[PDB]
PDB file of C-alpha atoms and ligand atoms in Angstrom:
ATOM      1  CA  UNK A1039       3.513  17.717 -16.396  1.00 46.23           C
ATOM      2  CA  UNK A1040       6.077  19.353 -14.349  1.00 44.29           C
ATOM      3  CA  UNK A1041       8.398  17.301 -12.175  1.00 43.13           C
ATOM      4  CA  UNK A1042       9.226  19.413  -8.896  1.00 44.22           C
ATOM      5  CA  UNK A1043      12.895  18.485  -8.378  1.00 45.67           C
ATOM      6  CA  UNK A1044      12.798  20.654  -5.219  1.00 47.40           C
ATOM      7  CA  UNK A1045       9.905  18.718  -3.716  1.00 47.59           C
ATOM      8  CA  UNK A1046      11.541  15.357  -4.561  1.00 48.69           C
ATOM      9  CA  UNK A1047      14.709  16.863  -2.760  1.00 48.37           C
ATOM     10  CA  UNK A1048      12.716  17.657   0.502  1.00 48.71           C
ATOM     11  CA  UNK A1049      11.267  14.084   0.494  1.00 47.15           C
ATOM     12  CA  UNK A1050      14.907  12.823   0.287  1.00 47.81           C
ATOM     13  CA  UNK A1051      15.846  15.032   3.015  1.00 47.59           C
ATOM     14  CA  UNK A1052      12.741  13.957   5.282  1.00 49.28           C
ATOM     15  CA  UNK A1053      13.748  10.173   4.838  1.00 49.46           C
ATOM     16  CA  UNK A1054      17.479  10.973   5.750  1.00 51.12           C
ATOM     17  CA  UNK A1055      16.264  13.259   8.774  1.00 53.12           C
ATOM     18  CA  UNK A1056      15.009  10.196  10.416  1.00 53.96           C
ATOM     19  CA  UNK A1057      18.478   8.781  10.758  1.00 54.31           C
ATOM     20  CA  UNK A1058      19.560   5.852   8.997  1.00 52.27           C
ATOM     21  CA  UNK A1059      16.759   3.565   7.636  1.00 49.28           C
ATOM     22  CA  UNK A1060      18.527   0.473   9.008  1.00 50.69           C
ATOM     23  CA  UNK A1061      15.884  -2.500   9.333  1.00 51.87           C
ATOM     24  CA  UNK A1062      14.928  -3.193  13.045  1.00 53.48           C
ATOM     25  CA  UNK A1063      15.518   0.290  14.151  1.00 54.86           C
ATOM     26  CA  UNK A1064      12.965   3.010  15.363  1.00 56.93           C
ATOM     27  CA  UNK A1065      14.193   5.538  12.421  1.00 58.87           C
ATOM     28  CA  UNK A1066      13.353   2.701  10.023  1.00 57.92           C
ATOM     29  CA  UNK A1067       9.758   2.382  11.589  1.00 54.63           C
ATOM     30  CA  UNK A1068       9.064   5.950  11.776  1.00 56.72           C
ATOM     31  CA  UNK A1069      10.088   6.208   8.037  1.00 58.43           C
ATOM     32  CA  UNK A1070       7.994   3.230   7.090  1.00 58.17           C
ATOM     33  CA  UNK A1071       5.050   5.291   8.318  1.00 61.40           C
ATOM     34  CA  UNK A1072       6.163   8.367   6.742  1.00 61.90           C
ATOM     35  CA  UNK A1073       6.675   6.773   3.096  1.00 61.27           C
ATOM     36  CA  UNK A1074       3.102   4.894   3.224  1.00 63.96           C
ATOM     37  CA  UNK A1075       1.437   7.941   4.652  1.00 63.79           C
ATOM     38  CA  UNK A1076       2.681  10.071   1.787  1.00 67.05           C
ATOM     39  CA  UNK A1077       1.540   7.474  -0.836  1.00 65.09           C
ATOM     40  CA  UNK A1078      -1.790   7.327   0.675  1.00 64.92           C
ATOM     41  CA  UNK A1079      -2.195  11.360   0.696  1.00 64.48           C
ATOM     42  CA  UNK A1080      -1.589  11.137  -3.006  1.00 63.23           C
ATOM     43  CA  UNK A1081      -4.371   8.748  -3.840  1.00 60.99           C
ATOM     44  CA  UNK A1082      -2.848   5.148  -3.707  1.00 63.58           C
ATOM     45  CA  UNK A1083      -4.427   2.240  -2.226  1.00 64.04           C
ATOM     46  CA  UNK A1084      -1.496   1.193  -0.006  1.00 65.31           C
ATOM     47  CA  UNK A1085      -0.369  -2.218   0.757  1.00 63.00           C
ATOM     48  CA  UNK A1086       2.436  -3.002   3.472  1.00 63.40           C
ATOM     49  CA  UNK A1087       3.958  -6.498   3.436  1.00 64.27           C
ATOM     50  CA  UNK A1088       5.290  -7.176   6.864  1.00 64.73           C
ATOM     51  CA  UNK A1089       8.074 -10.033   6.508  1.00 66.48           C
ATOM     52  CA  UNK A1090      10.555 -11.330   8.804  1.00 63.22           C
ATOM     53  CA  UNK A1091      13.364 -11.798   6.538  1.00 61.43           C
ATOM     54  CA  UNK A1092      16.918 -13.363   7.086  1.00 60.88           C
ATOM     55  CA  UNK A1093      20.004 -11.388   6.688  1.00 61.10           C
ATOM     56  CA  UNK A1094      23.427 -13.011   5.758  1.00 64.05           C
ATOM     57  CA  UNK A1095      24.425 -13.104   9.508  1.00 60.95           C
ATOM     58  CA  UNK A1096      21.034 -15.057  10.321  1.00 60.05           C
ATOM     59  CA  UNK A1097      19.371 -12.078  11.893  1.00 59.24           C
ATOM     60  CA  UNK A1098      15.709 -11.682  11.353  1.00 59.03           C
ATOM     61  CA  UNK A1099      14.735  -8.387   9.540  1.00 59.34           C
ATOM     62  CA  UNK A1100      11.404  -6.981  10.409  1.00 59.33           C
ATOM     63  CA  UNK A1101      10.845  -5.533   6.902  1.00 57.11           C
ATOM     64  CA  UNK A1102       8.056  -3.534   5.370  1.00 56.57           C
ATOM     65  CA  UNK A1103       7.485  -3.696   1.521  1.00 57.87           C
ATOM     66  CA  UNK A1104       5.392  -0.454   0.912  1.00 58.06           C
ATOM     67  CA  UNK A1105       3.213  -0.684  -2.268  1.00 57.05           C
ATOM     68  CA  UNK A1106       1.130   2.391  -3.557  1.00 56.40           C
ATOM     69  CA  UNK A1107      -1.231   1.194  -6.277  1.00 55.76           C
ATOM     70  CA  UNK A1108      -2.634   4.028  -8.341  1.00 54.19           C
ATOM     71  CA  UNK A1109      -5.927   3.672  -9.811  1.00 54.93           C
ATOM     72  CA  UNK A1110      -6.015   0.015  -8.773  1.00 60.90           C
ATOM     73  CA  UNK A1111      -8.948  -0.903 -10.978  1.00 60.99           C
ATOM     74  CA  UNK A1112      -6.886  -0.195 -14.028  1.00 65.37           C
ATOM     75  CA  UNK A1113      -5.579  -3.513 -15.372  1.00 61.71           C
ATOM     76  CA  UNK A1114      -2.807  -2.096 -17.452  1.00 62.46           C
ATOM     77  CA  UNK A1115      -0.086  -1.054 -15.146  1.00 62.22           C
ATOM     78  CA  UNK A1116       3.686   0.037 -14.979  1.00 64.10           C
ATOM     79  CA  UNK A1117       5.861  -0.886 -11.863  1.00 60.80           C
ATOM     80  CA  UNK A1118       8.057   1.951 -10.503  1.00 65.65           C
ATOM     81  CA  UNK A1119      10.292   0.892  -7.591  1.00 65.53           C
ATOM     82  CA  UNK A1120      13.141   1.589  -5.455  1.00 69.20           C
ATOM     83  CA  UNK A1121      14.861   0.428  -2.206  1.00 68.98           C
ATOM     84  CA  UNK A1122      14.162   2.600   0.889  1.00 68.50           C
ATOM     85  CA  UNK A1123      16.359   0.938   3.703  1.00 65.67           C
ATOM     86  CA  UNK A1124      19.942   2.270   4.398  1.00 66.17           C
ATOM     87  CA  UNK A1125      22.830  -0.282   4.767  1.00 66.91           C
ATOM     88  CA  UNK A1126      23.693  -1.060   8.337  1.00 67.88           C
ATOM     89  CA  UNK A1127      27.502  -0.835   7.274  1.00 65.73           C
ATOM     90  CA  UNK A1128      29.724   1.924   5.910  1.00 64.62           C
ATOM     91  CA  UNK A1129      31.929  -1.191   5.026  1.00 62.72           C
ATOM     92  CA  UNK A1130      33.581   0.895   2.207  1.00 64.28           C
ATOM     93  CA  UNK A1131      34.504   3.880   4.391  1.00 63.18           C
ATOM     94  CA  UNK A1132      38.107   5.073   4.381  1.00 64.33           C
ATOM     95  CA  UNK A1133      37.951   4.886   8.050  1.00 64.69           C
ATOM     96  CA  UNK A1134      37.723   1.232   9.401  1.00 61.79           C
ATOM     97  CA  UNK A1135      36.046   2.765  12.607  1.00 61.08           C
ATOM     98  CA  UNK A1136      32.872   3.394  10.523  1.00 64.57           C
ATOM     99  CA  UNK A1137      32.879  -0.236   8.654  1.00 65.58           C
ATOM    100  CA  UNK A1138      30.368  -1.530  11.106  1.00 64.05           C
ATOM    101  CA  UNK A1139      28.290   1.695  11.666  1.00 64.09           C
ATOM    102  CA  UNK A1140      25.229   2.565   9.177  1.00 66.04           C
ATOM    103  CA  UNK A1141      25.057   5.115   6.514  1.00 65.16           C
ATOM    104  CA  UNK A1142      22.426   7.769   5.949  1.00 64.55           C
ATOM    105  CA  UNK A1143      21.931   6.324   2.424  1.00 63.92           C
ATOM    106  CA  UNK A1144      20.926   9.704   1.085  1.00 64.79           C
ATOM    107  CA  UNK A1145      21.614   8.682  -2.448  1.00 66.79           C
ATOM    108  CA  UNK A1146      21.543   4.737  -1.764  1.00 67.77           C
ATOM    109  CA  UNK A1147      17.893   4.497  -0.691  1.00 66.93           C
ATOM    110  CA  UNK A1148      16.788   8.097  -0.357  1.00 66.26           C
ATOM    111  CA  UNK A1149      17.101   9.421  -3.892  1.00 66.79           C
ATOM    112  CA  UNK A1150      15.124   6.705  -5.503  1.00 65.79           C
ATOM    113  CA  UNK A1151      12.324   6.974  -3.139  1.00 67.90           C
ATOM    114  CA  UNK A1152      12.078  10.663  -3.217  1.00 67.26           C
ATOM    115  CA  UNK A1153      11.719  10.931  -6.899  1.00 67.60           C
ATOM    116  CA  UNK A1154       8.947   8.366  -6.882  1.00 68.69           C
ATOM    117  CA  UNK A1155       7.417  10.313  -4.016  1.00 66.18           C
ATOM    118  CA  UNK A1156       7.021  13.372  -6.205  1.00 69.32           C
ATOM    119  CA  UNK A1157       5.622  11.165  -9.198  1.00 72.46           C
ATOM    120  CA  UNK A1158       3.101  10.142  -6.685  1.00 69.18           C
ATOM    121  CA  UNK A1159       2.258  13.641  -5.991  1.00 72.55           C
ATOM    122  CA  UNK A1160       2.252  14.618  -9.907  1.00 69.73           C
ATOM    123  CA  UNK A1161       0.071  11.661 -10.846  1.00 69.28           C
ATOM    124  CA  UNK A1162      -2.507  12.543  -8.233  1.00 66.50           C
ATOM    125  CA  UNK A1163      -2.730  16.087  -9.699  1.00 66.47           C
ATOM    126  CA  UNK A1164      -2.868  14.578 -13.327  1.00 66.14           C
ATOM    127  CA  UNK A1165      -4.041  11.152 -13.553  1.00 66.62           C
ATOM    128  CA  UNK A1166      -2.239   8.979 -16.231  1.00 64.76           C
ATOM    129  CA  UNK A1167      -4.033   6.978 -18.663  1.00 64.62           C
ATOM    130  CA  UNK A1168      -2.339   3.650 -17.187  1.00 68.41           C
ATOM    131  CA  UNK A1169      -2.182   2.329 -13.581  1.00 69.28           C
ATOM    132  CA  UNK A1170       0.903   2.836 -11.706  1.00 67.59           C
ATOM    133  CA  UNK A1171       2.349   0.818  -8.708  1.00 70.29           C
ATOM    134  CA  UNK A1172       4.945   2.504  -6.907  1.00 69.52           C
ATOM    135  CA  UNK A1173       7.033  -0.122  -4.704  1.00 71.56           C
ATOM    136  CA  UNK A1174       9.536   0.679  -2.049  1.00 73.06           C
ATOM    137  CA  UNK A1175      11.468  -2.502  -1.340  1.00 74.20           C
ATOM    138  CA  UNK A1176      12.908  -3.033   2.111  1.00 72.65           C
ATOM    139  CA  UNK A1177      16.073  -4.855   3.469  1.00 73.44           C
ATOM    140  CA  UNK A1178      17.891  -4.252  -0.175  1.00 76.38           C
ATOM    141  CA  UNK A1179      21.053  -3.102   1.245  1.00 78.01           C
ATOM    142  CA  UNK A1180      21.942  -5.642   4.177  1.00 77.75           C
ATOM    143  CA  UNK A1181      24.108  -7.768   2.089  1.00 81.79           C
ATOM    144  CA  UNK A1182      27.316  -9.309   3.256  1.00 79.75           C
ATOM    145  CA  UNK A1183      29.887  -6.613   3.999  1.00 79.49           C
ATOM    146  CA  UNK A1184      33.462  -6.364   2.844  1.00 78.81           C
ATOM    147  CA  UNK A1185      34.721  -7.233   6.296  1.00 79.02           C
ATOM    148  CA  UNK A1186      33.099 -10.571   6.216  1.00 82.66           C
ATOM    149  CA  UNK A1187      34.963 -13.364   4.197  1.00 84.17           C
ATOM    150  CA  UNK A1188      32.202 -15.934   3.529  1.00 85.49           C
ATOM    151  CA  UNK A1189      29.986 -15.649   0.522  1.00 85.01           C
ATOM    152  CA  UNK A1190      26.382 -16.470   0.563  1.00 85.37           C
ATOM    153  CA  UNK A1191      24.022 -15.982  -2.560  1.00 84.84           C
ATOM    154  CA  UNK A1192      21.098 -13.709  -2.556  1.00 84.94           C
ATOM    155  CA  UNK A1193      21.896 -11.647   0.797  1.00 80.98           C
ATOM    156  CA  UNK A1194      21.040  -8.439  -1.116  1.00 82.80           C
ATOM    157  CA  UNK A1195      17.500  -7.434  -2.148  1.00 84.31           C
ATOM    158  CA  UNK A1196      15.776  -9.398   0.569  1.00 83.95           C
ATOM    159  CA  UNK A1197      12.520  -7.398   0.281  1.00 82.26           C
ATOM    160  CA  UNK A1198      12.294  -7.704  -3.470  1.00 79.32           C
ATOM    161  CA  UNK A1199      12.849 -11.400  -3.299  1.00 78.73           C
ATOM    162  CA  UNK A1200       9.856 -11.745  -0.920  1.00 82.50           C
ATOM    163  CA  UNK A1201       7.478  -9.512  -3.022  1.00 81.23           C
ATOM    164  CA  UNK A1202       8.420 -11.153  -6.282  1.00 80.21           C
ATOM    165  CA  UNK A1203       7.501 -14.540  -4.951  1.00 77.80           C
ATOM    166  CA  UNK A1204       4.698 -13.245  -2.829  1.00 74.63           C
ATOM    167  CA  UNK A1205       2.940 -10.377  -4.478  1.00 74.11           C
ATOM    168  CA  UNK A1206       0.791  -7.818  -3.022  1.00 75.36           C
ATOM    169  CA  UNK A1207      -2.198  -8.735  -5.206  1.00 76.42           C
ATOM    170  CA  UNK A1208      -2.427 -12.214  -6.503  1.00 74.01           C
ATOM    171  CA  UNK A1209      -1.170 -12.565 -10.087  1.00 74.39           C
ATOM    172  CA  UNK A1210       0.100  -9.050 -10.085  1.00 76.87           C
ATOM    173  CA  UNK A1211       1.199  -7.794 -13.451  1.00 77.07           C
ATOM    174  CA  UNK A1212       2.927  -4.869 -14.966  1.00 76.41           C
ATOM    175  CA  UNK A1213       3.548  -3.939 -18.580  1.00 80.00           C
ATOM    176  CA  UNK A1214       7.349  -3.153 -17.458  1.00 77.32           C
ATOM    177  CA  UNK A1215       8.932  -1.850 -14.537  1.00 75.21           C
ATOM    178  CA  UNK A1216      11.524   0.866 -13.827  1.00 76.33           C
ATOM    179  CA  UNK A1217      13.670   0.795 -10.953  1.00 78.04           C
ATOM    180  CA  UNK A1218      15.688   3.929  -9.607  1.00 77.74           C
ATOM    181  CA  UNK A1219      18.650   3.527  -7.595  1.00 79.97           C
ATOM    182  CA  UNK A1220      21.275   5.999  -6.596  1.00 78.76           C
ATOM    183  CA  UNK A1221      19.538   8.853  -8.852  1.00 79.28           C
ATOM    184  CA  UNK A1222      20.406  11.743  -7.025  1.00 77.33           C
ATOM    185  CA  UNK A1223      24.298  12.282  -6.898  1.00 77.09           C
ATOM    186  CA  UNK A1224      26.155  15.234  -8.409  1.00 75.71           C
ATOM    187  CA  UNK A1225      27.524  14.415 -11.745  1.00 76.56           C
ATOM    188  CA  UNK A1226      25.570  11.073 -12.140  1.00 77.33           C
ATOM    189  CA  UNK A1227      25.466   9.299 -15.285  1.00 76.20           C
ATOM    190  CA  UNK A1228      23.333   6.388 -16.150  1.00 77.93           C
ATOM    191  CA  UNK A1229      24.645   3.753 -18.381  1.00 81.45           C
ATOM    192  CA  UNK A1230      22.437   0.953 -19.785  1.00 82.26           C
ATOM    193  CA  UNK A1231      22.637  -1.748 -17.274  1.00 83.68           C
ATOM    194  CA  UNK A1232      23.461  -5.232 -18.874  1.00 80.90           C
ATOM    195  CA  UNK A1233      20.651  -7.212 -16.970  1.00 84.02           C
ATOM    196  CA  UNK A1234      18.110  -4.426 -18.052  1.00 87.08           C
ATOM    197  CA  UNK A1235      19.373  -4.614 -21.715  1.00 87.50           C
ATOM    198  CA  UNK A1236      18.972  -8.516 -21.622  1.00 89.04           C
ATOM    199  CA  UNK A1237      15.346  -8.594 -20.347  1.00 88.83           C
ATOM    200  CA  UNK A1238      14.030  -5.143 -20.834  1.00 88.68           C
ATOM    201  CA  UNK A1239      15.768  -4.117 -23.881  1.00 88.36           C
ATOM    202  CA  UNK A1240      12.630  -2.329 -25.622  1.00 89.44           C
ATOM    203  CA  UNK A1241      12.021  -0.364 -22.492  1.00 89.21           C
ATOM    204  CA  UNK A1242      15.571   0.728 -21.961  1.00 87.14           C
ATOM    205  CA  UNK A1243      15.333   2.203 -25.556  1.00 87.69           C
ATOM    206  CA  UNK A1244      12.155   3.665 -24.620  1.00 85.48           C
ATOM    207  CA  UNK A1245      13.547   5.501 -21.547  1.00 86.11           C
ATOM    208  CA  UNK A1246      16.864   6.398 -23.035  1.00 85.16           C
ATOM    209  CA  UNK A1247      15.190   7.637 -26.301  1.00 87.20           C
ATOM    210  CA  UNK A1248      12.790   9.896 -24.205  1.00 86.21           C
ATOM    211  CA  UNK A1249      15.500  11.226 -22.090  1.00 82.47           C
ATOM    212  CA  UNK A1250      17.607  12.402 -25.089  1.00 81.61           C
ATOM    213  CA  UNK A1251      14.267  13.946 -26.484  1.00 80.15           C
ATOM    214  CA  UNK A1252      13.910  15.859 -23.360  1.00 80.34           C
ATOM    215  CA  UNK A1253      17.501  16.928 -23.349  1.00 81.83           C
ATOM    216  CA  UNK A1254      18.802  14.614 -20.835  1.00 84.75           C
ATOM    217  CA  UNK A1255      21.159  12.671 -22.902  1.00 85.57           C
ATOM    218  CA  UNK A1256      24.137  14.092 -20.871  1.00 84.82           C
ATOM    219  CA  UNK A1257      22.565  11.770 -17.826  1.00 83.57           C
ATOM    220  CA  UNK A1258      21.232   8.773 -19.607  1.00 79.69           C
ATOM    221  CA  UNK A1259      24.314   7.674 -21.671  1.00 76.96           C
ATOM    222  CA  UNK A1260      24.185   5.835 -24.820  1.00 77.42           C
ATOM    223  CA  UNK A1261      26.556   3.125 -23.790  1.00 77.56           C
ATOM    224  CA  UNK A1262      26.524   0.139 -21.743  1.00 74.99           C
ATOM    225  CA  UNK A1263      27.379  -0.011 -18.188  1.00 76.56           C
ATOM    226  CA  UNK A1264      27.928  -2.931 -15.696  1.00 76.91           C
ATOM    227  CA  UNK A1265      25.890  -6.040 -14.640  1.00 73.42           C
ATOM    228  CA  UNK A1266      24.336  -5.075 -11.471  1.00 75.62           C
ATOM    229  CA  UNK A1267      22.735  -7.129  -8.803  1.00 75.55           C
ATOM    230  CA  UNK A1268      19.782  -5.067  -7.743  1.00 78.58           C
ATOM    231  CA  UNK A1269      15.890  -5.296  -6.928  1.00 79.49           C
ATOM    232  CA  UNK A1270      15.245  -5.500 -10.752  1.00 79.39           C
ATOM    233  CA  UNK A1271      16.980  -8.875 -11.045  1.00 81.48           C
ATOM    234  CA  UNK A1272      14.555 -10.394  -8.443  1.00 81.48           C
ATOM    235  CA  UNK A1273      11.426  -8.803 -10.082  1.00 80.81           C
ATOM    236  CA  UNK A1274      12.439 -10.038 -13.461  1.00 80.53           C
ATOM    237  CA  UNK A1275      13.340 -13.566 -11.963  1.00 78.90           C
ATOM    238  CA  UNK A1276      10.006 -13.680  -9.831  1.00 77.07           C
ATOM    239  CA  UNK A1277       7.343 -12.453 -12.230  1.00 79.02           C
ATOM    240  CA  UNK A1278       9.090 -12.465 -15.686  1.00 77.19           C
ATOM    241  CA  UNK A1279       8.271  -8.804 -15.914  1.00 75.93           C
ATOM    242  CA  UNK A1280      10.576  -6.947 -17.871  1.00 77.39           C
ATOM    243  CA  UNK A1281      12.442  -4.441 -15.590  1.00 75.96           C
ATOM    244  CA  UNK A1282      15.056  -1.877 -16.199  1.00 78.98           C
ATOM    245  CA  UNK A1283      17.469  -0.269 -13.560  1.00 79.14           C
ATOM    246  CA  UNK A1284      18.254   3.442 -13.670  1.00 81.05           C
ATOM    247  CA  UNK A1285      21.489   3.321 -11.510  1.00 81.99           C
ATOM    248  CA  UNK A1286      24.563   5.589 -11.247  1.00 85.21           C
ATOM    249  CA  UNK A1287      27.642   3.878 -13.163  1.00 83.27           C
ATOM    250  CA  UNK A1288      30.927   5.202 -12.201  1.00 83.25           C
ATOM    251  CA  UNK A1289      33.643   4.154 -14.512  1.00 82.13           C
ATOM    252  CA  UNK A1290      36.550   5.616 -12.454  1.00 79.57           C
ATOM    253  CA  UNK A1291      35.898   3.548  -9.305  1.00 80.35           C
ATOM    254  CA  UNK A1292      36.918  -0.141  -8.705  1.00 76.61           C
ATOM    255  CA  UNK A1293      33.141  -0.761  -7.571  1.00 75.48           C
ATOM    256  CA  UNK A1294      31.510   1.206 -10.186  1.00 74.68           C
ATOM    257  CA  UNK A1295      29.506   3.499  -8.025  1.00 73.81           C
ATOM    258  CA  UNK A1296      30.185   6.973  -6.852  1.00 70.62           C
ATOM    259  CA  UNK A1297      33.064   7.420  -4.390  1.00 73.26           C
ATOM    260  CA  UNK A1298      30.583   7.855  -1.494  1.00 75.22           C
ATOM    261  CA  UNK A1299      29.006   4.290  -1.894  1.00 78.31           C
ATOM    262  CA  UNK A1300      28.719   2.580   1.227  1.00 80.54           C
ATOM    263  CA  UNK A1301      30.796   5.211   2.997  1.00 81.34           C
ATOM    264  CA  UNK A1302      29.413   7.861   5.384  1.00 80.35           C
ATOM    265  CA  UNK A1303      29.967  10.354   2.673  1.00 80.95           C
ATOM    266  CA  UNK A1304      26.668   9.290   1.328  1.00 82.04           C
ATOM    267  CA  UNK A1305      24.794  12.418   2.619  1.00 81.40           C
ATOM    268  CA  UNK A1306      22.402  15.238   1.334  1.00 85.25           C
ATOM    269  CA  UNK A1307      25.945  16.911   0.456  1.00 86.36           C
ATOM    270  CA  UNK A1308      25.882  15.020  -2.837  1.00 85.57           C
ATOM    271  CA  UNK A1309      22.147  15.580  -3.978  1.00 90.47           C
ATOM    272  CA  UNK A1310      21.786  17.446  -7.027  1.00 88.96           C
ATOM    273  CA  UNK A1311      18.208  18.704  -8.048  1.00 88.34           C
ATOM    274  CA  UNK A1312      19.365  18.671 -11.740  1.00 87.54           C
ATOM    275  CA  UNK A1313      20.150  15.027 -11.521  1.00 85.83           C
ATOM    276  CA  UNK A1314      16.750  14.377  -9.813  1.00 85.36           C
ATOM    277  CA  UNK A1315      15.108  16.632 -12.515  1.00 83.90           C
ATOM    278  CA  UNK A1316      16.515  14.603 -15.274  1.00 85.74           C
ATOM    279  CA  UNK A1317      15.242  11.233 -13.869  1.00 89.87           C
ATOM    280  CA  UNK A1318      11.867  12.626 -12.752  1.00 89.26           C
ATOM    281  CA  UNK A1319      11.193  14.565 -15.907  1.00 89.77           C
ATOM    282  CA  UNK A1320      12.027  11.443 -18.011  1.00 86.90           C
ATOM    283  CA  UNK A1321       9.936   8.929 -16.433  1.00 86.79           C
ATOM    284  CA  UNK A1322       6.994  11.383 -16.124  1.00 83.83           C
ATOM    285  CA  UNK A1323       7.112  11.964 -19.871  1.00 82.04           C
ATOM    286  CA  UNK A1324       7.296   7.979 -20.406  1.00 83.49           C
ATOM    287  CA  UNK A1325       4.382   7.065 -18.274  1.00 85.31           C
ATOM    288  CA  UNK A1326       2.066   9.585 -19.546  1.00 85.05           C
ATOM    289  CA  UNK A1327       2.920   8.578 -22.954  1.00 83.41           C
ATOM    290  CA  UNK A1328       1.932   4.918 -22.249  1.00 83.58           C
ATOM    291  CA  UNK A1329      -1.534   4.216 -23.798  1.00 80.73           C
TER     292      UNK A1329
HETATM  293 ZN1   ZN B 532      23.828   0.127  -1.312  1.00 78.03          ZN
END
């Protein structure tokens, strides 16, 4: 079917228009209703995991993991996921005055949700043969900031850790999983992420092959990228479900992400419909080609 990059663009704009999706803010709460409501409008049976999660600083985060289960009676299922919270710190900003102030997270948060929001629209209009679980993970981007010296493990991906050990349905199972992260920036290039190739090799090939078949090899690069801490690591760990990350890899930065990453430059100004189009068209092709 047709992926509407313009609609996925408006869904990103709608989230960011709330203000930053920082856990324990009202903008976060209004956005939680908005995301779950849209999933339900497009035929999903919606599950909201409310969990009080502890950030690196000991703060209790009132998180919502949002699960849209499509055709929930189908036993053969694919997991599509992304994080929806916005980081509380622009801790890589060039202005130190912004280091403890939140980011809009248009690309880091908004893009991966927005694409999956249009997917929900498309699969309500043309039901796929397989079941689809759309999962929006909370409290992914609240990890220890650069301006804190002490290291603690697993302070990122707080929501995906909870769900992976506490699924929304008992014995939840997916054939494989596809994570979308920072999938809207102008000039994005998604290299094959190392954790993905390790545990989801057959599906990295599935996604990268389909992407080139559709003409999106300029986006899905046939080369290896970084080893990345992301939500797909904790779903792999917890369910042993093979998961891949479609995540921007920027080889020119020290961090490996776009220059706006964890800055207040992560706004709608960077979102590229053609980047959105590539990712959305590719995933729609693969899921409808699952039997
Ligand atoms: Zn982030």
